[PDB]
Design a protein around this nucleic acid. Structure first.
Length: 340
DNA sequence: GTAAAAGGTAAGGGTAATGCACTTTT
DNA sequence: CAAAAGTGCATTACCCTTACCTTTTA
């Protein structure tokens, strides 16, 4: 499910055996991993890893592999032993797994019994004491972080990514029936309460109004209007008001629209409006951006030009006087006069 | 008794992993 | 040509943190 301490130990061991097999050094392997395409035994080795580690893609296995020998750029995929915040280091999870295994062997519990007692509404004194000692052995990290981690990692629910159409529906009806009560709902569906929230907030809440296609000009414009009415930005509320895109989709689209672009001057605005006006005339009453992006070639991305067009429509008085076609032609002509 | 510390639950938040359409390489 | 594999882009799987309660501990 996730890259744990075991997965790193497997990689390192498989790599040590690789070197011994072909009489190679770790420096020689690191040199091969600087190249884009792999060859020979190293190519055969990765193929094995992909098969031996089905929980991960070849792309992500390579990212970890290249990180293991250190290849610049792959630092973020490198092994982490400990941290005070965010993701748990491989040594932290190892300590937890050791403490849980010790606590479970004591008192004679199964790991299933352990998970149920953790999630038994109000945990008993033995569980409360288990937490206390665990916090001391991870004193660097906030005790609440460890508390949330353990619950998520040790649960009685069936953890899986596949939600069916019916299960999605059953969730909906539960929310209609009981409200935003994910613990009550979660137990009814044998699902981790947080997973129920996520399924609802990011998928099922939207119903059939959710879109996967490319954003429309109207959709992108609406997105800009709602961010103007508002940390600073609550993407969950943003998606709710837009109604056709998830919070992460909105968060992503907004970032692309507002990315750092080259300063649009008078001449730059003219070229854009002229390239748009060509698409308005030659093509149907629509804007084909495929040709516009290509002619820009690196200076602006699609979303950046769209962002600029939105602001031009809002600021140029011609767009309040005339329809899109004529207003654009008027906007260009007015832009050409001031250039004198 | 008290106040401090910690559990329980839901809102808020964010990135590595991945799918996809694509080019590139064997 | 098929097939294996790399890659930018948008989405997904999956996780963590904060806020605000109630409950337990000292």
């Amino acid at each position: 499910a996730r890259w744990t301490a075991e997965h790193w130990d497997y990689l390192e061991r498989r790599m040590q055996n690789f070197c011994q097999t072909y009489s190679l050094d770790h420096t020689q392997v690191a040199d091969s991993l600087h190249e884009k395409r792999l060859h020979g035994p190293l190519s055969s080795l990765v193929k094995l890893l992909v098969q031996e580690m089905p929980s991960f893609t070849r792309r992500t296995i390579l990212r970890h592999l290249r990180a293991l020998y250190n290849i610049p750029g792959y630092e973020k995929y490198s092994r982490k032993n400990s941290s005070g915040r965010g993701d748990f280091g491989v040594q932290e999870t190892a300590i937890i797994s050791q403490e849980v295994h010790n606590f479970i062997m004591d008192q004679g519990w199964s790991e299933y019994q352990f998970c149920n007692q953790i999630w038994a509404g109000k945990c008993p004194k033995t569980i409360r004491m288990f937490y206390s000692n665990l916090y001391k052995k991870l004193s660097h990290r906030d005790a609440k972080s460890i508390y949330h981690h353990v619950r998520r990692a040790y649960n009685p629910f069936e953890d899986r990514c596949v939600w069916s159409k019916e299960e999605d529906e059953e969730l909906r009806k539960n929310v209609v029936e009981h409200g935003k009560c994910w613990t009550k709902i979660g137990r009814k569906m044998a699902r981790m309460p947080n997973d129920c929230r996520d399924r609802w907030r990011d998928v099922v809440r939207f119903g059939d109004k959710l879109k996967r296609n490319a954003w429309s000009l109207e959709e992108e414009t609406q997105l800009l209007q709602i961010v103007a009415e508002l940390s600073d930005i609550n993407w969950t509320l943003v998606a709710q008001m837009l109604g056709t895109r998830t919070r992460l989709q909105c968060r992503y689209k907004f970032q692309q629209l507002t990315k750092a672009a080259s300063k649009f001057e008078l001449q730059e605005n003219v070229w854009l409006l002229e390239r748009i006006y060509d698409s308005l005339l030659n093509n149907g009453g629509k804007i084909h951006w495929e040709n516009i992006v290509k002619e820009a070639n690196g200076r602006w991305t699609r979303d950046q030009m769209l962002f600029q067009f939105i602001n031009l429509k809002k600021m140029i008085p011609s767009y309040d006087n005339l329809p899109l076609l004529e207003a654009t032609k008027s906007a260009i002509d007015d832009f050409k006069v001031v250039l004198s």
